[PDB]
Amino acid sequence: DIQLTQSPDSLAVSLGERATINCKSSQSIFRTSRNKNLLNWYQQRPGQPPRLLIHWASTRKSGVPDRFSGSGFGTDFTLTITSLQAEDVAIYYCQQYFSPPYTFGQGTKLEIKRTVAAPSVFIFPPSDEQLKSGTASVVCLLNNFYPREAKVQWKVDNALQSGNSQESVTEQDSKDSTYSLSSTLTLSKADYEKHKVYACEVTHQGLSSPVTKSFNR
Amino acid sequence: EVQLVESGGGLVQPGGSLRLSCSASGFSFNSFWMHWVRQVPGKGLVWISFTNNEGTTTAYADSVRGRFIISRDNAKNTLYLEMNNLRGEDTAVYYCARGDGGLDDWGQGTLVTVSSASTKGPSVFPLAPSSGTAALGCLVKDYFPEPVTVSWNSGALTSGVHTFPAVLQSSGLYSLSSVVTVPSSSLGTQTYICNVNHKPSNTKVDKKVEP
Numbered sequence: 402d403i404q405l406t407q408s409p410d411s412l413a414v415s416l417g418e419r420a421t422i423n424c425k426s427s428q429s430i431f432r433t434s435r436n437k438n439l440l441n442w443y444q445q446r447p448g449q450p451p452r453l454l455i456h457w458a459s460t461r462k463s464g465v466p467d468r469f470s471g472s473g474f475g476t477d478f479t480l481t482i483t484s485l486q487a488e489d490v491a492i493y494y495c496q497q498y499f500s501p502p503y504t505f506g507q508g509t510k511l512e513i514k515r516t517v518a519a520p521s522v523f524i525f526p527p528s529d530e531q532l533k534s535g536t537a538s539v540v541c542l543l544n545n546f547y548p549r550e551a552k553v554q555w556k557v558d559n560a561l562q563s564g565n566s567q568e569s570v571t572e573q574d575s576k577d578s579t580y581s582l583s584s585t586l587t588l589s590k591a592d593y594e595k596h597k598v599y600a601c602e603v604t605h606q607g608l609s610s611p612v613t614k615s616f617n618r
Numbered sequence: 619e620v621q622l623v624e625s626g627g628g629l630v631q632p633g634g635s636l637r638l639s640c641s642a643s644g645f646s647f648n649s650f651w652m653h654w655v656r657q658v659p660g661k662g663l664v665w666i667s668f669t670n671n672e673g674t675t676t677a678y679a680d681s682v683r684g685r686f687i688i689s690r691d692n693a694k695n696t697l698y699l700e701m702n703n704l705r706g707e708d709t710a711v712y713y714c715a716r717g718d719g720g721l722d723d724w725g726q727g728t729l730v731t732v733s734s735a736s737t738k739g740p741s742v743f744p745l746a747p748s749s750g751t752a753a754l755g756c757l758v759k760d761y762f763p764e765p766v767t768v769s770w771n772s773g774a775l776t777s778g779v780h781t782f783p784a785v786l787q788s789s790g791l792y793s794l795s796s797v798v799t800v801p802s803s804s805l806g807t808q809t810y811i812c813n814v815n816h817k818p819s820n821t822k823v824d825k826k827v828e829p
């Protein structure tokens with residue numbers, strides 16, 4: 402069936418500038434009898450259902466800002482977003498409404514390029530309630546940084562931990578265009594009690610030099 | 619308005635069956651095509667099925683044809699998707715959508731988890747305040763299946779709140795954290811409680827976070 406390929410896969414563009422997102426179909430989706438290209442464009446913000454921006458390739462749905470425009474014909478289409486706003490952060494999809502299965506493109510992730518922001522760093526010791534259960538989770542928080550890139554290091558008594566921590570990062574914030582990251586170090590209570598200095602080391606662009614937040618059992 | 623509400627999603631055994639419902643309001647239901655679309659969390663939208671106005675024409679994605687059956691009850695303003703012989707690859711959020719010029723309106727979606735793993739409710743642990751500004755939170759550990767929701771002070775605290783996407787652990791159980799930053803001074807004067815809800819296990823917890 403009809404394949405739709407978007408380019409690029411991910412797009413990083415600056416506030417106030419213009420974003421250009423292509424969709425190519427494996428065959429024409431112009432319906433002659435309607436004189437329409439049957440292509441839809443959607444925006445899907447973090448944690449939301451998709452929102453329809455454009456249908457028939459170039460017709461905006463009411464309520465959608467005129468910053469969003471669709472163009473193209475036949476097998477080649479483009480979504481343009483003028484004067485990017487922080488809230489435009491989202492994954493954008495094209496979809497053909499020409500013949501079932503009404504297939505979607507693979508999506509284009511839009512990242513907002515903003516000024517570099519340093520992460521505020523915090524560490525959290527395990528709770529007594531958890532320790533009672535036999536496990537110790539140590540959490541490091543890097544709050545509101547940009548860009549996404551960061552190395553988070555766990556040092557136990559200054560040793561360098563590998564393969565016993567997990568990270569989760571939020572979606573780019575819809576307002577300040579920053580990310581936050583959580584790192585969790587997980588050890589048994591037994592292993593946890595045999596050490597004193599737990600350290601989370603954070604290196605980032607917005608950091609003059611690495612920052613260490615730590616605690617002593 | 620237009621309101622669509624999917625229901626019927628949850629944890630189901632591989633090979634088993636489920637039937638999703640989508641309740642429609644705020645428009646002339648029998649006047650529009652209706653669609654089902656799915657999405658593995660973190661991944662793309664995948665078109666699943668549609669039916670024309672009277673349900674006399676339908677179609678299905680290649681990967682579900684012969685396994686799924688879409689239907690609609692116009693008198694009842696309800697769309698259905700019967701899903702049989704479910705596979706791990708069918709795990710996704712399922713959306714119903716009203717067709718017009720495009721798929722113009724979408725429900726919030728319902729999560730279908732196809733797995734032989736047991737339902738397990740989370741433990742909820744405090745992340746003790748770090749102290750200017752202070753950070754505190756809740757670690758929601760060791761649950762299955764997704765999802766969990768978290769709020770703070772019954773939704774009264776929203777500014778500065780970061781609820782991280784869940785991570786699948788080595789044990790095959792999920793874990794997530796919700797944190798929030800607040801003025802270090804308010805630690806002395808303000809009560810902070812994360813409200814956790816893991817509906818799949820009927821687990822609702824309110825955990826006071828204090829120094």
Ligand SMILES: CC(=O)N[C@H]1[C@H](O[C@H](CO)[C@@H](O)[C@@H](O)COP(=O)(O)O)O[C@H](CO)[C@@H](O)[C@@H]1O
Pocket residue numbers: 439498499649650651652671716717718719720
């Ligand atoms: C691909 C597409 O646009 N599907 C729409 C359909 O459009 C059909 C295409 O077969 C056209 O025939 C349409 O131009 C006829 O409209 P109407 O029935 O006279 O109001 O109309 C339905 C609504 O009937 C909508 O739900 C549905 O999204």
